[PDB]
Amino acid sequence: LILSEENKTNIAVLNLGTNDRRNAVLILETALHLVEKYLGKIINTSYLYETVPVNYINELMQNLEESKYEENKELIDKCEEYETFLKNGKVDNSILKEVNVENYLLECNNIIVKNDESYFYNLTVVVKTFVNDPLSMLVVIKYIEELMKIIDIDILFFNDFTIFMKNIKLEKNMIYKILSKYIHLERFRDPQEIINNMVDNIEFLSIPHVYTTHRYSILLCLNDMIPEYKHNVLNNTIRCLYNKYVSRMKEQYNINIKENNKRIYVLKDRISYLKEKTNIVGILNVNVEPKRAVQRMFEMINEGASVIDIGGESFGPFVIPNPKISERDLVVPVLQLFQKEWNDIKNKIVKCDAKPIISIDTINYNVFKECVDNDLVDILNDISACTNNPEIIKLLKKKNKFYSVVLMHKRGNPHTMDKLTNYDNLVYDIKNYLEQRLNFLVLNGIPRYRILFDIGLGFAKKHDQSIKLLQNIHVYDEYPLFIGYSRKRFITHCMNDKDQLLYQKNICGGLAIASYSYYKKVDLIRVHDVLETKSVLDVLTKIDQVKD
Amino acid sequence: ELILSEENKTNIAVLNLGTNDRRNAVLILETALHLVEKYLGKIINTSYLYETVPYINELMQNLEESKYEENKELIDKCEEYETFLKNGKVDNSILKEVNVENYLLECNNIIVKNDEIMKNSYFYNLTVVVKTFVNDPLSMLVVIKYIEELMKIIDIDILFFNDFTIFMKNIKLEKNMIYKILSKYIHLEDPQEIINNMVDNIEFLSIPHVYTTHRYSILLCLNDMIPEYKHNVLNNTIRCLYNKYVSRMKEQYNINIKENNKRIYVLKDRISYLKEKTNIVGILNVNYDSFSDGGIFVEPKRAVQRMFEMINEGASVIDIGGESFGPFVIPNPKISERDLVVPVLQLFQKEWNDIKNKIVKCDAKPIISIDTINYNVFKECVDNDLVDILNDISACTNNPEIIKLLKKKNKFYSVVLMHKRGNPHTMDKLTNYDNLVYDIKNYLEQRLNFLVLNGIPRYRILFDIGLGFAKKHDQSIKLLQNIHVYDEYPLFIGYSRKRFITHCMNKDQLLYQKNICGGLAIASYSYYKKVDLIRVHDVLETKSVLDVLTKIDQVKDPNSSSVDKLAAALE
Ligand SMILES: Nc1ncnc2c1ncn2[C@@H]1O[C@H](COP(=O)(O)OP(=O)(O)OP(=O)(O)O)[C@@H](O)[C@H]1O
Ligand SMILES: Nc1nc(O)c2nc(CNc3ccc(C(=O)O)cc3)cnc2n1
Ligand SMILES: Nc1nc(O)c2nc(CNc3ccc(C(=O)O)cc3)cnc2n1
Ligand SMILES: Nc1ncnc2c1ncn2[C@@H]1O[C@H](COP(=O)(O)O)[C@@H](O)[C@H]1O
Ligand SMILES: [Ca+2]
Ligand SMILES: [Ca+2]
């Protein structure tokens, strides 16, 4: 009943590990892609963590064998099997032989004790899987591992099952037989010489995985995705287990474990440590001739911007509608000239890790599709938090690429914004709103660690409400936070040729908010005045660097 | 009486000066200082001013002279005072001394008897050490009472008088005995309508004063001046009693006793609460303002315009100077410092006075500070009421006599003391410190002690670490990293446009801009460290930054944070 024709939908929790800091993202993201291709749908992910307890991949992705199972990108609002899995409601009897608590505890404990005798990059995922059983799932997992010619993908959970199968002998053609049930094996190029590897790689099978409740890096991840979840073989919920291990660490060793184990977010393709640097995002409001616009982009890189945010649709208050030129026509050419002039890499080839991350400020599906088709951008800055056209969420995943996104809170539009100002609980309403939005992308397979939050200063907030959101920015301490205060009316509201005076004050007032952001450890600030902001951040950094 | 026997002596007495008139605290209290300086002896120590929670302008003209002479002369040490601090041998008290127990019982009695009468507003407080020619406390109390009367408001208590231990239960004096004691010290001559109020006033005499150990405000002040002093009557040094009080209020009533017991500094004539506001001090360097054209003439009209621009831009203080003290290129010719600053300051005084407008701006007038080390320049400014503050980058080392101009018959001026070594050509190589942070701090505390010994009020003295003066770039940073060591003191700093900001960075007006912006970073940092005064060129930019940071800090409900949080978790 192992290769039962009775196709099912099960819930599996995986753990993905690599050891290589420089390639972690590509490595783990490659694994993510091969999970979505080969196992089912990703419907949850944790953050990426650095824990302390080359490029054949690019052309692996070309030469993949087709799955025998379909991919479906339609947005879902809800997933019933997941609700069921979280709740410990009823599912179909395991096809693999279970063990009771007592035996699991012993046979688990046994494996730990017996095991008694660098950097690690961790990530968990929930998969709604069409694979029948954990052992099969492992087979496929071992395929994926061997494909990536470096990666350790463990099965943390698989429904409410408890399984300790003690010795596993799998015939060389059963392994082929299993894979074929789920993959259009080309019978890399040749699957023959992969099988013989996997022959010995499955010794036993423990569900839950042995270390689930014993490795910090595991509980850290699971705490992100499924904090209220209580498996049968656990004293308490993930949260409690997580909390207990954190506070307990302070007693046994006075350790404060968060310090070793750093949360990560990703803007393009490298690690960023949450709360460890205030990146500048320079604004390019194209509203300006391509060549000119591109000079500005170059000015900005050199003035110290990590990110350029280009937009051709003005989202500021009461701004004028003018039918003359389309958002596409403004932004796409500019990005194309940029990518051209950058690619003239006769200049130092080492200065291509100088390349700015490119962000496009749009809600328009058509604009983003062209940008992504033509590799012109890295990030979607969607000021509707992807609510205006959620189809846009499907553009954040390619076969072998993930894009990051900024989710901003607003109400209404440029004309109505200033009216839509009532909030029962301003700070938490908005936070809860961004959490609801993040949950939505995450259910739809956007990596949690590629999603950035923005409270949308000046968008359906009075000026006191904008200040109040800054005063309470601490509520974002756990999240990658992106803000834009630059040149907004609320700065000027704070102050004791009239219009030139006011401009300067407003720019200088923004540098105060650069200072505040720096101390609040805001991850990105969206600014017009890049040289000024960089000067501020450089000085505050020196004042912090306390080495002799 | 041995009391009136003209056996002329020097005694050490420690006084308390208290008022409750908020708006005039400075005036009331400094006037009292003046009368104590004239009629009692020499002021050789002062505390800070503190806000605690439990016709004068004319009167100064018509004051009877003193039978004792006043020396404005500077001293380096004061042996009597040294002797008072260690409790070395001093002449027996002419008044009868009680013993510890007896003393202790009578105070306890006064403390309890007073509880009930009250068991049936803010204060402004200041202590002072006086080296006195009065022979005993009762005489001093008599003169003190005269001073009070003369002022019509004020409460001047004696807290110590050498090592003596006195309690004198019942006191009436003939209006005759009074006139005699008064006549001993003051040239008397109406005085009579004064003398009659005084008869009943002196119910008793307690030395040390009854409340010395019970009122936080008194220990608070004394801890500024004589931390290490132990009286026979006291269980421990003033420092220890002070710390124990703070700590007991914390442990036992869960109160932070400091929170409504605020240290004050004075820039001109108004109360400033230490650490409550970062004031902008706008720079007017006439030398620069005038010879950067490449020109050769002083333009005083242009200079005064700049002063008005700065006032509108939000400067609270204007620092004017003629000598260039920066490291760079000197275009100083025949035209003197005096000629650079005094004309400008005089046109400013005229222009401010010929305010065509109604005197709406009367209370919005900037404090004027002069960046000089020069006795003559300062004297001219002070004699013609052109300046308020001496800004002395030598910490009064170039000419200590300049300290005597901070004081007048009825005026006190505030002073900035700054640390440097050498001069503009020399200073960049004068960079070896055994302990950078503490050497500079100790230096300034020694200058403060010197000025305080010479009766400059403690709360009028401001410290400046002197960024970029005999400091490498990394040392300038290190002084900012360690600015907390100034948490007890009025702190004035000067980072504006100095080389060390640029070195923090990675056409050529790019540097200028990077520098001005990098400075706004330090305004930010100064804001959070609660620096009292920052000396800046770019007033408008600095004011924007402070305005916005002040706004972000102004919260409506201080518990809203955790409340709204809870509201949200309850859904
Ligand atoms: N050391 C002292 N200094 C000043 N006055 C003293 C002292 N010892 C006794 N007295 C006198 O005894 C009385 C009590 O001293 P205290 O300073 O408490 O009085 P007070 O401040 O005038 O009274 P209150 O402020 O409680 O109305 C005063 O009338 C004062 O003349
Ligand atoms: N993610 C993100 N975050 C922003 O803050 C933002 N702001 C604008 C500019 N929009 C505004 C809004 C309000 C105001 C005013 O009150 O002045 C001005 C400009 C454009 N894209 C943005 N994208
Ligand atoms: N009280 C006070 N505090 C200062 O800091 C100050 N600075 C100057 C200007 N002097 C300098 C010194 C160093 C530097 C450089 O390294 O660039 C520049 C200018 C003039 N008066 C001053 N007065
Ligand atoms: N749930 C599981 N997930 C992955 N490997 C497992 C699991 N249970 C047992 N193993 C086996 O344990 C061995 C070492 O991997 P690990 O236990 O993940 O360190 C391999 O032979 C795995 O096949
Ligand atoms: Ca899939
Ligand atoms: Ca005198």
Ligand SMILES: [Mg+2]
């Ligand atoms: Mg292993």
Ligand SMILES: [Mg+2]
């Ligand atoms: Mg493993």
Ligand SMILES: [Mg+2]
């Ligand atoms: Mg009194």
